[model samples]
Target: GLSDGEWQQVLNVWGKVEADIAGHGQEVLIRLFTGHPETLEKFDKFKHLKTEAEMKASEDLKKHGTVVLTALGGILKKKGHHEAELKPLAQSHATKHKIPIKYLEFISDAIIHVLHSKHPGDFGADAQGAMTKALELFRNDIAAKYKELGFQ
Candidate 1:
């Protein structure tokens, strides 16, 4: 369910990109069409106008886009195997992105909360309540911080 939700979110974001291009109409009409038989039939109106720019852009998008989807699927498959290793890498990335160290700490806490909640007995936790509490605490902290930064 989590992977499905994540994948759908990725699609939703990508769909916005499609929608934006669709709004440009005939001026950029060629860019909307794909030459594949199925795609050409589906977007027949734009098929005649398809150009090299459109083909190259679509190819590049598909090339890099699949990488993110594959990585997400792999992570979901090996969920518990990488947290210890991933956290440091995530921290380094956040640091490079100029995220505050305190915010990185909050992110780490939230991740731990998710882990504990999802694997209660495996983590030696008797119940999921502590994990819930951790999530709630982290949520409140992160929400306030984001709000202060003008984020909703």
Candidate 2:
């Protein structure tokens, strides 16, 4: 659900990119528009949205993405520490998604990055331990859902 203004901004950016590429043929003008990382940063800038509704929506989106990453991390960590109880769920998700199990390390890193970015100094040992437990519970819930759906 993009707001009307956001939708228009997206179209405007894409249209500009298309027009520039068509007219300039990847020369200095095109590179001038595309080379700067800040060009894409406009779309990525979620930090400045002021309204409470907008702020809540952005936070919700981040939380949901983090939850999925956390769940994957939980499965990977659990499989390493308690293989007999956790390996099957980890393997099942990997098989269903056709992603390598080794990729969980990347997902774990992403979760850690998100947590650190959001909480920085507040994410001390206790906070991290709590998150680890929550992530494990979330993973178990997702595993149950998959079982109900006959996925594995």
Candidate 3:
């Protein structure tokens, strides 16, 4: 469980960045694909992007990035009450998107990196650790839901 102080920190930074969910989310996805090229195969719309330029130029990437960030914002708004929120996400990935459990960890890391990179002054080690712990909680919850949906 995340401490109240940690929760406040996460929300505090999120407040500053949520205004440009598209930009930050896109950055997170770019970082994710850069670090794990294999993930590109999961996105048919983006699989053909062979270069960083191509990835950055793709409008589809921007839209998908916004989608991801929106989901995360929903999670944060709901706090720990994420069962309903995570269920659809887990089901989609498990049934169709085919995102593996470990990949969720990668996305969380990418999110942390993007957040820190965006606001270096605000997201120091303390805020970064809080984000990590919070995302860990969400990732684990989604994994459990994935298992329930028969996505071993």
Candidate 4:
């Protein structure tokens, strides 16, 4: 859904930082935990990781963040299974975890904040806009699945 240039920006921005995929993902998790303390209670593994230092070095957190990066990487490849790729994951989030939509919304914004926090002006507006749209598309798709299951 991004223009070619915008898409390139997305690739470039994320590509440059994907080297530290774990950290980028960690910041997103940390932001959610800090921004909304209740978000942590949803995860048994993460519920105990309340402090910044604890979260920073948490392999559990790293795994979760890595899963996200992996999933994103999966989509970027776009092989021949886009639906099979993300639908199941989205459904599980909606039905299995029952993640509140508020948390979803927070995460969507949090990743963009990651870009800002990680790189002040390097990502530029185009990259930020592309990443925001890409994430919103993913989040909204998942949220739509939640709606389909009659979740509020």
Highest lDDT, which number?
Answer: 3
Best by TM-score: 3
For candidate 1, the per-residue lDDT at 26 reads 20
Per-candidate Cα lDDT values, in order, are 0.38, 0.41, 0.86, 0.78
Candidate 1, residue 68: Cα displacement in angstroms equals 1.0
TM-score of each: 0.26, 0.32, 0.94, 0.88
After superposition, the stretches of candidate 1 with alpha carbons farther than 4 Å from their true spots are 1-56, 97-152
Give me the runs in candidate 4 sitting further than 4 Å from their true place.
76-81
Question: What are the per-residue Cα lDDT tens digits for candidate 3 across 61-124?
Answer: 9998998888888898776888898888888888989899989999988888888788878778
- lDDT value for candidate 3? 0.86
Question: Which sequence of candidate numbers ranks them by lDDT, best first?
Answer: 3, 4, 2, 1
Give per-residue CA lDDT, model 2, range 1-152, as digits (tens): 23344334433333332443322121221122233323222333433544434534454434533444344444444423444545555565545553332333334334444455544685566545544544444455545545555554
Query: In terms of TM-score, how similar is model 4 to the real structure?
Result: 0.88
User: Which of candidates 1 and 2 is the stronger one according to lDDT?
Assistant: 2
Expressed as tens digits, the lDDT of each residue in 3-86 for candidate 1 is: 444434434333333443322222122222322233333333334535655644564344433442344234334322445434
TM-score of 3: 0.94
